[PDB]
Amino acid sequence: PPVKRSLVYYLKNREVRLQNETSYSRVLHGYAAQQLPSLLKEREFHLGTLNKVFASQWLNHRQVVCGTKCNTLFVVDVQTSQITKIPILKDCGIHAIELNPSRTLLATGGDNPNSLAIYRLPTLDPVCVGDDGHKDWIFSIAWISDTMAVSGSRDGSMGLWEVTDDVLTKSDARHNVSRVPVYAHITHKALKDINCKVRALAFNNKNKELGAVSLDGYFHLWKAENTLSKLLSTKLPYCRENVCLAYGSEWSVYAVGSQAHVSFLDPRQPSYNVKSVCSRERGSGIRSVSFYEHIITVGTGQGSLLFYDIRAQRFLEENLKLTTGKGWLNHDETWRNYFSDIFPNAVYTHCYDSSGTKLFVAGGPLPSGLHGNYAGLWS
């Protein structure tokens, strides 16, 4: 038979409890997803003088954490407009924040931009030190299981690290025998080496693969069923400025960014099914990308979010496009030298909500010589 697909059946069955079931839980969202883009409104936040927001992740319905160029790690409430600053972990600030699939651990950079750090959610207590497996930066921290994590780097090292059950136990025991922060090192169970820098990652969660990206323009898929085992590689379609890549967990396509295009890549399929949608916003660079049910949110440098529809192959709505505010700026000596004759805050990060209604954008100014925060919550 044809699919029983209509919102009215759900509406009227819901009233009787008879078959309002969860075969609809995927149409309600396919509908809300194309509805929201048209009815979002900014609400600025006042951070102060922090440099540039690089990482952001939701912790609750209300608290989102952010990491900056001045390697601050701060939790902002989205209701009360409250910034709280937390420690940092010893052994160009923060560049990537992720939460283990169980939402219990938090794997971000530390006092060393070449080491790592591990906080235990939902209480943020510091747990581990950064390890030595990377002498260069950490530019991506993906989670592959409840305790194994894979860390890209600006040298090329792809060191699998993994929080052990033993450090789990002496971490739920080290905060009882004491209350002062106590840490614990880990060894990189692997240090597999590979314009040879592991910038951005992804994670498919059925084939247990880790199709990464390297800024020279090279995709590198390294399956991790339980441990890393490199599988394949490929020169990506566009060459310049490939810094963002995500995977649509139910569309079997990788969305990867570029200078002025966005590419849909099927890995186990060859390079003649590569579609690069043009943004035409020439001069920004797609600094972030994310998947809602069938809707790709692109976050660029000129300060504007754009929306694409994987199914109708075209953009939403003249294409709907938000625009980030002004925020804050610093008037340093380099502001006087080369950046006084003119800022379009560039959205480096954006994330939706567990309840799928409120979006959170953050960023700063695009020229590297500048210094200015910005962060805004769009519902």
Partner: peptide
């Protein structure tokens, strides 16, 4: 000018 990695 730019250079923000």
């Amino acid at each position: 000018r730019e250079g923000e990695e």
